[PDB]
């Protein structure tokens, strides 16, 4: 359900067309892009965080 957040962010991108010279607002969206792109590879990267006592 993150697409509503990002859809309203691109809505504010085509509305931040109206204010040229954005200092750090797009950089704040860059920081949420940074850790949101980090968290998905973090959750997909891991194994089930346990020692496999049956086989291993």
């Amino acid at each position: 359900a993150k697409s509503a957040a990002n859809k309203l962010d691109w809505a504010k991108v085509i509305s931040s067309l109206r204010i040229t010279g954005s200092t750090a607002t797009q950089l704040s969206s860059f920081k949420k892009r940074n850790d949101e792109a980090r968290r998905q590879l973090l959750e997909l990267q891991s194994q089930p965080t346990e020692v496999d006592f049956s086989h291993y």
Partner: protein
């Protein structure tokens, strides 16, 4: 690291920008102007205002009263001729 906030800083912005002066100028320029040539008082009579209304407005504006005034001097000294010579 945080939410930056320039979408809503138009509160103390709307004095500083340059067409604000023109906006506050012509909202003052437009209120007290009579709408469509109203309150014209197109007729006035003071025993000679009809002379101005027939001769000295923007519409007629022809040199004929000068002509009349020319004849006025023709009316003036010639009678003084009959008083002098």
């Amino acid at each position: 690291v945080s939410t930056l906030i320039p979408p809503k800083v138009v509160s103390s912005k709307n004095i500083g920008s340059a067409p604000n002066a023109k906006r506050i100028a012509n909202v003052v320029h437009f209120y007290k102007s009579l709408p469509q040539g109203p309150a014209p008082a197109i007729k006035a009579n003071t025993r000679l205002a009809r002379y101005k209304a027939k001769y000295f407005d923007g519409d007629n504006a022809s040199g004929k009263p000068l002509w009349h005034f020319a004849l006025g001097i023709i009316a003036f000294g010639y009678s003084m001729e009959y008083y002098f010579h």
